Amino acid sequence: GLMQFTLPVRLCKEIELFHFDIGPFENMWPGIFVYMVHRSCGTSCFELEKLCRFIMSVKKNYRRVPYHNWKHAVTVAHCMYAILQNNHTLFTDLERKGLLIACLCHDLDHRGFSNSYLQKFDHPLAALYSTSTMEQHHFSQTVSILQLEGHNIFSTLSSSEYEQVLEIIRKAIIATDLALYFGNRKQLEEMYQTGSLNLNNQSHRDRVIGLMMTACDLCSVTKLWPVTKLTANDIYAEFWAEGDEMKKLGIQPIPMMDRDKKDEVPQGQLGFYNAVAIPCYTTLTQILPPTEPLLKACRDNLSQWEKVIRGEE
Ligand SMILES: O=C(Nc1cc(-c2ccccn2)nn1CCO)c1nc(C2CC2)ccc1Nc1cncnc1
Ligand SMILES: [Mg+2]
Ligand SMILES: [Zn+2]
Fold first, then answer.
1. Which ligand is nearest to the Cα of residue 72, counting in written order?
2. Which ligand is nearest to the CA of 231?
3. Where do the catalytic residues lie?
4. How far is Cα of residue 149 from the mean position of the Cα atoms in its chain?
5. Of 3, 11, 82, 279, which residue is 20 to 30 A from 208 by alpha carbon distance?
């Protein structure tokens, strides 16, 4: 009860900033998460013993893939922490509980392959879940772990509160399907500009949490350039392996996934920043002004990719 988590000075200060990198010491990541839960939710939110057992079972169900791994889970959780801490009074008690857990669990049991590749492989999950295939699986894995003995971190919630939190988590995890992001942001853009955006309207809150989930999920493009540059290697390492597996099915992959077209990556990053990342953080900053540092960091990384093309690095 009186047992706080306390980080070294550099981490204690820098964890509050959006561009915080959780570092290469895997064994510090559970502690960093509990720290964030304690400050963002409270020391009373979860029974420490059940939370630690939950965290370690979640860790075990993330695979050793180059990008969609345990480090990504905790990285996405930290971006959500920074958003919640900079927007203190906008979110309910159940939302702060749900969203950190949603982020930690959002890529559970990811194999480093897109929904498209599962469909073309004819994977059993593509028959089980026709759209948002991996995201429905990630939610399924979250419920399974919550139901392990001693793992139910929501055990103190009423029946209706429990259903609400699991509904917040389901929608938040489904929203990480980038296919759903484009329409969600356009609707939030129209709602914001016509002045019809209303945070008392549950269907509006749902859309705003969806955009938050995309922002946290893409947050590797909001880090300092050396972090972003090296994380980009990890994501393309998955993309290129998926392209190899497309070639094994007799399908020429898209250039994004073709290791024979590495020269096209700088221009592919420009497209990604202009079409996905900058619009995301722009709409998020309009709705949640204190998230402006994510937009600034993203623009700085776009400028670095423009320098790579101009051969300045
Ligand atoms: O870069 C990403 N995507 C991309 C590459 C190309 C492309 C197109 C042509 C040629 C080369 N590349 N097009 N697109 C758009 C569709 O994903 C990317 N995607 C995702 C989520 C699966 C969507 C997450 C992070 C990403 N980047 C990243 C950069 N830095 C640090 N961490 C991550
Ligand atoms: Mg995902
Ligand atoms: Zn993710």
1. 3
2. 1
3. 68 (proton donor)
4. 27
5. 11
Whole-angstrom CA distances from 12 to 9, 21, 51, 83, 119 are 5, 12, 21, 17, 44
CA distance 218 to 24: 19
Chain breaks in the chain (C to N over 2.5 A) after: none
Half-sphere CA count of 170, side-chain side, radius 13 A: 9
Check residue 51 and report its DSSP letter.
Answer: H
What was the elucidation method?
Answer: X-ray
Q: Whose CA is nearest to atom 27 of ligand 1?
A: 232
Amino acid at 135: E
Query: For residue 7, which amino acid is it?
Result: L
Tokens of residue 223, six digits: 């880090």
Kindly state if the Cβ of 212 falls inside 6 Å of ligand 1: no
DSSP class of residue 263 equals G
Is position 106 annotated in a ligand binding site? yes
- The DSSP element (H or E) to which 236 belongs, if any, is helix 225-248
Type of residue at 49: E
Q: 82 with 20: CB under 8 angstroms?
A: yes
The verdict on whether 110 is a catalytic residue reads no
> What are the phi and psi torsion angles at 15 (to 5°)?
-65, -25
Q: What is the helix, strand, coil percentage profile of the chain, to 5?
A: 70, 0, 30
Q: Are 190 and 207 in contact (CB under 8 A)?
A: no
- 47 to each of 59, 164, 248, how far by Cα in Å? 18, 19, 48
Give SS3 for 213.
Answer: helix
Cα of 9 vs centre of ligand 2, distance in Å, is: 32
Which is nearest to 111 in space by CA: 69, 73, 145? 69
Residue ranges of E strands in the chain:
none
